[PDB]
Amino acid sequence: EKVLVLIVGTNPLPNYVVGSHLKEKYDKFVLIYSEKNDKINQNSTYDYAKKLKEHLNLNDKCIFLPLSDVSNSEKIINDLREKFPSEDFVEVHLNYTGGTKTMVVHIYNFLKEKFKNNKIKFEGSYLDARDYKLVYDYSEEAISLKDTIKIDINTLLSIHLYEDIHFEFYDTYSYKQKFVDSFDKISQEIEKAIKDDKGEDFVKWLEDPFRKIFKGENKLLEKTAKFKKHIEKLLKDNDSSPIVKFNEKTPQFIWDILNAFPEGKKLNDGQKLWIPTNDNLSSRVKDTVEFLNGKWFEWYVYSQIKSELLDRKLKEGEHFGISLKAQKKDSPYFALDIFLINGYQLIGISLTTSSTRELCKLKGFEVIHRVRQIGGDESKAILITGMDKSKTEDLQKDLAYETGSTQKRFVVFGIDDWADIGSKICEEVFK
Amino acid sequence: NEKVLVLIVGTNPLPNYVVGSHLKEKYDKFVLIYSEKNDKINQNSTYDYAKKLKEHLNLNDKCIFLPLSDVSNSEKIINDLREKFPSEDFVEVHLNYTGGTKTMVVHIYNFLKEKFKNNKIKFEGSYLDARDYKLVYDYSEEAISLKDTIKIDINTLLSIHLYEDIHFEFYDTYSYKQKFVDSFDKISQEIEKAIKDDKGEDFVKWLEDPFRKIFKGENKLLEKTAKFKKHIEKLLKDSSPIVKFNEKTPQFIWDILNAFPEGKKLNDGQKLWIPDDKITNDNLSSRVKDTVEFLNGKWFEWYVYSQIKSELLDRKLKEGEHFGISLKAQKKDSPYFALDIFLINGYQLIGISLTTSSTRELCKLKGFEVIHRVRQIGGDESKAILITGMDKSKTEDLQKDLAYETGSTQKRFVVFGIDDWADIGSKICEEVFK
RNA sequence: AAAA
Ligand SMILES: [Mn+2]
Ligand SMILES: [Mn+2]
Secondary structure (H helix, E strand, C coil): CCCEEEEEEEEEEEECHHHHHHHCCCEEEEEEEEECCCHCCCCCHHHHHHHHHHHHHHHHHHHEEECCCCCCHHHHHHHHHHHHCCCCCEEEEEECCCCHHHHHHHHHHHHHHCCCCCCCCCCCEECCCCCEEEEEEECCCCCCCCCCCCHHHHHHHHHEEEEEEECCCCCCCCCCCCCCCCCCHHHHHHHHHHHHHHHHHHHHHHHHHHHHHHCCCCCCHHHHHHHHHHHHHHHHHHHHHHHHHHHCCCHHHHHHHHCCCCCHHECCCCCCEECCCHHHHHHHHHHHHHHHHHHHHHHHHHHHHHHHHCCCCCECCCEEEEEEEECCCCCCEEEEEEEEEEECCCEEECCCCCCHHHHHHHHHHHHHHHHHHCCCCCCCEECCCCCHHHHHHHHHHHCCCCCCCCCCCCEEEEEHHHCCHHHHHHHHCCC | CEEEEEEEECHHHHHHHHHHHHHHHHHHHHEEEEEECCHHECCCCCCHHHHHHHHHCHHHHHHHEEEECCCCCCHHHHHHHHHCCCCCCCCEEEECCCCCCCHHHHHHHHHHHHHHCCCCCCEEEEEECCCCCCCEECCCCCCCECCCCCCCHHHHHHHHHEEEEEEEEEECCCCCCHHHHCCCHHHHHHHHHHHHCCHHHHHHHHHHHHHHHHHHCCCHHHHHHHHHHHHHHHHCCCCCCHHHHHCCCCCHHHHCCCCCHHHHEEEEECCCCCCCCCCCCHHHHHHHHHHHHHHHHHHHHHHCCCCHHHHHHHHHCCCCEEEEEEEEEEEECCCCCEEEEEECCCCEEEEEEEECCCHHHHHHHHHHHHHHHHHHHCCCCCEEEEECCCCCCHHHHHHHHHCCCCCCCCCEEEEHHHCCCHHHHHHHHHHCCC
């Protein structure tokens, strides 16, 4: 009988990886977790322990071992002496990656002593987050797990206690349905413009005049009356009106983008703004305005990454996708623009066409927190912005947080990366 | 004779500073075990933290630095210890093993337990509990609460976390007290009176419409008379926020507006002041610019700060050391951060981010920001409070939305909303100190 | 300071 002992902290991912790699070699699994004691400010990791048992399919081979106090050696040793299985194991393997420092020292030294009898082989190991290696005590076996252990997005979110997972594929992208028969032409025209280095020109026009016409009061594009009132206000600026700029200063590559939309979903009438039924207005403008206001950039980047990832053995749906959402039980949903899994490292990618320092900064804080919540503390966050290189470098330094590794866990791309964004993400993710 | 304290320098310097402050006076030597930098194994150095610890604990020549080449490798760790741990005769070796990787902990603990297993050398190990603020001993079985005994100031806290060029304002040096000299107290007391009268939600509604419709447009709208008068003529033709200002403004907001000096009033009597053609750009800016920026959000900063100041002094916190307004600092050659209010209870940093906004999306972004900031400057056990203008339901949603599990039952991200403004002083007091 |  051979037993593997895992220490259940609040990062289930390392225990999942070690367990996936070693489960075949063991007959019993002891998951050591914390009880909830509100009066010493101690939450339980039982919920993680259950998820580990569940996704590692341990079933009847799993023993759960609760510790009443994970900060007190005395009580830790007391609970171990009382509760640790007293069977005649021939090998006891403790992986001491998870948990508090005291849990580690005292579980380690408890087990080494309890099983000192040389009929029993004691082994300790540790999953190194920096170099993706399982290191054994005194053995220098040093096996890299970086490329060997895989996880899909459903398992990753599940062990971090997220549920109701939804995302989209290239074949299920929602705007492909909203723009029937025209999506490909639309996305081609946009991809052509970005590859021709017109992204900055595009975002400038989107900011002015596009957002000045089609973004104002809430439900502006849902009530024909409110929209015409907005049109007549802007016409008061005369030659300085956004409408005049729309009609007279729009570049040909933007007219071609606008004219790629289906006849009944175009913002223009000839080379002129369409000046207006509420449901007929919504059917004409709603999806088109929402797509042009930024969703297009989500699709563009996703289609640039897909190719590279297909060559790399990743499986769409399991290892990458677009428009990820999920929730903890009875809790609000998050939204992440693009996810990618390299081995067992989550890379969350957040996209904005903004060039403004303040807005991109806030999006940075957001993507850092989300990948931590859903993929754990060793996840990578990428922010793709419309900022110049100087601003992206500042933002990287501004939000950098130190965790002991030499590689950045928060990376910022900018307007000059848009044309070759697939290659830039390939380089950054697969290092 | 000689007694040595051993500390493991991870990337969270605060625990080590706290254990060191508590035990400094009882030890003759301090060994700071830190990591070396090696890009091949993706391993950064914690030397910068070790050096801040030596500095801010005033260790001087009693400090021995001990570098580890590889903090994931038991054999290299033991080798480095064998070669670099001081060889003098010690009567006591105390290892506090709170910091570092788990392999650092296990092998440093066991290396020292073995090396100093003599009958007359006292070996001790301790652990600082982040959850109940207890220094816990392995062999003596002591458990000593440090929550109220160990203190730290904002300058020391930010410095050990590698921040520098620290600035902030005092109650008596607050910036708007100069822009409304002779009138600040009257203005803020009128606002305070209304917010304490549960007019918060009404105030914010009015600020959104019509106040922000009239006074928030193009950049420098309120400093160019032509831009402002054009803007007003456009609004007048429309209904009009000018009509709503003149006809639908509640009495308590007239009382706030009328608390400003006459030359800083937005109103001309019981109507909106409209600049005449004789009004220069300077006249327009001098009348309106500071008043508008205050009413558009800055007032909230002063309001919340003023509601907690007496409570903090009553708890013997020292302004400037343990609390303050408009904190800014930076890492070397890096952009500055801005934090609306900071507070320090014992050694836990509380950062408070304020906004009058009631929109979910904006309040969520500010939530992410204060979470990250207090982590950067105060470490992993800091608390972030976000005070918004949202209703209770949106405030509760946002707390659960951004909640992150680190093993504690007390939340380290707290959100307050419009319903909390009238008693925000006691709300923060109960939240922070209980 | 519960994969530093
Ligand atoms: Mn986005
Ligand atoms: Mn604020």
